[PDB]
Write a protein that binds this ligand. Structure first.
Ligand SMILES: CC(=O)N[C@H]1[C@H]([C@H](O)[C@H](O)CO)OC(C(=O)O)=C[C@@H]1O
Length: 656
């Protein structure tokens, strides 16, 4: 039970002395503090409480828990005379505002001198636990004489003044156990996660959210389940899905939808320290960056990039499709172990052919790229990962089918990237086996890289359009036969853009592709013939981002706003990083120019905001899922439970 509990303490920098209440309560020196608070101003460094030596010369002798204006939660524990200075923290731990209101967060700190660890919790998640060599509890700091809410008394002055309301604050004179404190910090923020660390997927990490609303009124999500931290590469990544049959209120437990099993779907504690965060899973095959579209006949497509083990955006040969042309048909090449050339193709029924003799072999390749010999599966041992800061990838005794995308395969595909698609006839309950896309860029070129989010059906032609990019060009993958066959329009860009794009239709036959660039701006290209030819790029005047850029989301909206047809855009908007998420409403004019009339800031401007996805809910509200952190920063790698789902009414989005 609490040694002290206070409530509804509103403050604006000044703090409140509780020295009389807490002096003499902390017998061992260990402590737990749980704080339910909301901020009225996020600016500056703010302490939720402070325990200090207030006397002159002793300003580096204190304990506190602090909040930064970018959502970082941390704690310090410092002693002047021994020059001991502990700082434990994690970025992107709290929420600032939501729809014009200060957000209530619940955070906690645990100091355990037996373990020599400081632990921090926020909103149901243990955001960090750190064993420290120079551990300090309250009794270890010389001359503690001052205990304060909403600041730290340093040399008789109030430092780090907190602005807001401490709704409830509990001080305990012992280290409370992990599961209790997780429970105490659980609140409404906790329930905005669809995908959670070590849920049904087995993944501790997630990135690249996608939302889509189907014609039947189901709302559907896909996401990258990234098992080896959040690294784009190298990594072990599956695509997970989850859906809602009630306008987004409740969601199904996540299922794996695209996955390889050369590594198992298991939780790994990826090291965040500078010395380990660069580590990667190197040996594992991957699906990455999903795109969803619903056809006119209500069948659903999902596309994803496919990386064989060892291959990424970085390693993939750019000069080979992985396909061969034989009598006007395209067939995937394979290289057998011990050969240097690619002497084999996969042809009809998955039969592996020796191209030299033009004869079928005894080998075949199944619908999931698994290898058979005489109609029986070849096997390989699955890998596990183990730590200590010593990472090892090792064979674990479990047998899985040998696969042409694996490290230990007898027959291997060219080490480049591919695109695969799967189809569903039951709005995402079940999915067909993956089909690899044919060499639409040419035989001597790797496939493009998907622009995550959604594709579209252009209404005047029924053309299906899937966005992708090469690093130098936009690659608009399309089908004019309701998805039976695919072509591409390649459009050279002004520079080396990572041209992650999304489409909107302005009017029949007129589409725009809005995309990331390498120049700091969002570009948009216009076609007035349903995607066949594209104008020169124009740029939005009101977004200004770092040169590297970030993925965006833009969707058509079904209902009139101010009597006009509308589009809705989600993007970060800050030259300081992947920060300052905004939702913009653009109203289409009769001449097909857009009036960008409204914008809404999702949280405060220094809070993290990376990849995002929008959908129109059946009730005509808006669903938003996004990466509430900076996914470019090397400081914000390998963080759990940082991809929330939130919703807006149009009237909410009109404000800011
Ligand atoms: C296929 C792949 O690697 N996709 C990744 C993409 C890509 O590497 C970049 O476009 C190269 O320029 O980068 C990012 C990113 O947050 O910046 C996320 C994607 O998951």
């Amino acid at each position: 039970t609490p040694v002290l509990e206070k409530n509804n303490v509103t403050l604006t920098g000044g703090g409140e002395n509780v020295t009389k209440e807490l002096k003499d309560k902390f017998t061992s020196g260990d402590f737990t503090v749980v704080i339910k608070y909301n901020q009225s101003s996020e600016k500056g460094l703010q302490a939720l409480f402070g325990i200090s030596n207030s006397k002159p010369g002793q300003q580096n002798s204190y304990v506190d828990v602090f909040l930064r204006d970018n959502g970082e939660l941390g704690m310090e524990a410092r002693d002047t005379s021994s020059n001991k200075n502990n700082l434990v923290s994690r970025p992107a731990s709290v929420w600032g505002k939501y729809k014009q209101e200060a957000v209530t967060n619940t955070v906690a700190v645990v100091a355990d001198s037996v373990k020599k660890t400081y632990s921090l919790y926020a909103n149901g998640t243990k955001v960090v636990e750190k064993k420290v060599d120079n551990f300090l509890n309250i009794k270890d700091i010389k001359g503690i004489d001052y205990y304060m809410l909403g600041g730290v008394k340093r040399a008789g002055k109030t430092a780090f003044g907190f602005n807001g309301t401490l709704e409830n604050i509990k001080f305990f004179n012992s280290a409370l156990d992990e599961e209790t404190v997780k429970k105490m910090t659980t609140n409404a923020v906790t329930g905005h996660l669809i995908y959670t660390a070590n849920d049904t997927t087995g993944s501790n990490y997630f990135r690249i959210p996608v939302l889509y609303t189907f014609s039947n009124g189901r709302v559907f999500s896909s996401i990258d389940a990234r098992y080896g931290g959040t690294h784009d590469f190298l990594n072990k990544i599956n695509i997970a899905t989850s859906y809602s049959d009630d306008n987004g209120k409740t969601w199904t437990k996540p299922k794996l939808t695209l996955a390889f099993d050369d590594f198992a779907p298991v939780p790994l504690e990826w090291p965040r320290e500078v010395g380990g965060r660069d580590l990667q899973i190197s040996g594992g095959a991957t699906y990455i960056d999903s795109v969803i579209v619903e056809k006119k006949n209500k069948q659903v497509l999902m596309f994803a990039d496919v990386m064989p083990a060892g291959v990424s955006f970085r390693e993939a040969t750019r000069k080979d499709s992985g396909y061969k042309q034989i009598d006007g048909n395209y067939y995937l090449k394979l290289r057998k172990q011990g050969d240097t050339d690619y002497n084999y193709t996969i042809r009809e029924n998955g039969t592996v052919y020796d191209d030299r003799t033009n004869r079928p072999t005894e080998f075949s390749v199944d619908k999931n790229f698994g290898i058979k010999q005489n109609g029986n599966y070849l096997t390989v041992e699955q890998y596990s990962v183990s730590f200590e800061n010593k990472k090892t990838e090792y064979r674990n005794g479990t047998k899985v089918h040998m696969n042409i995308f694996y490290k230990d395969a007898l027959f291997k595909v060219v080490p480049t990237n591919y695109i695969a698609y799967i189809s569903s006839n039951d709005h995402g309950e079940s999915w067909s086996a993956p089909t690899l896309l044919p060499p639409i860029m040419g035989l001597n070129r790797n496939a493009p890289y998907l622009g995550p989010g959604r594709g579209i059906i252009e209404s005047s032609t029924g053309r299906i359009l899937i966005p992708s990019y090469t690093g130098k060009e936009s690659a608009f993958i399309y089908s004019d036969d309701n998805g039976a066959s695919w072509k591409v329009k390649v459009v050279p860009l002004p520079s080396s853009w990572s041209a992650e794009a999304q489409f909107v239709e302005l009017s029949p036959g007129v589409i725009q592709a809005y995309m990331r660039t390498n120049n700091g701006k969002i570009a948009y290209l216009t076609s007035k013939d349903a995607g066949t030819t594209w104008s020169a790029p124009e740029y939005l005047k009101f977004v200004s981002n770092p040169s590297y850029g970030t993925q965006l989301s833009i969707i058509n909206y079904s209902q009139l706003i101010d009597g006009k047809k509308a589009v809705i855009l989600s993007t970060p908007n800050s030259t300081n990083g992947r920060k300052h998420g905004q939702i913009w409403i653009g109203l289409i004019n009769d001449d097909n120019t857009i009036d960008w009339r409204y914008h809404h800031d999702v949280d405060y401007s220094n809070y993290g905001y990376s990849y995002s996805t929008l959908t129109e809910l059946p009730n005509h509200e808006i669903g938003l899922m996004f990466e509430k952190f900076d996914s470019w920063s090397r400081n914000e790698l390998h963080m759990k439970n940082v991809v929330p789902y939130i919703t807006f009414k149009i009237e909410d989005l009109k404000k800011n």
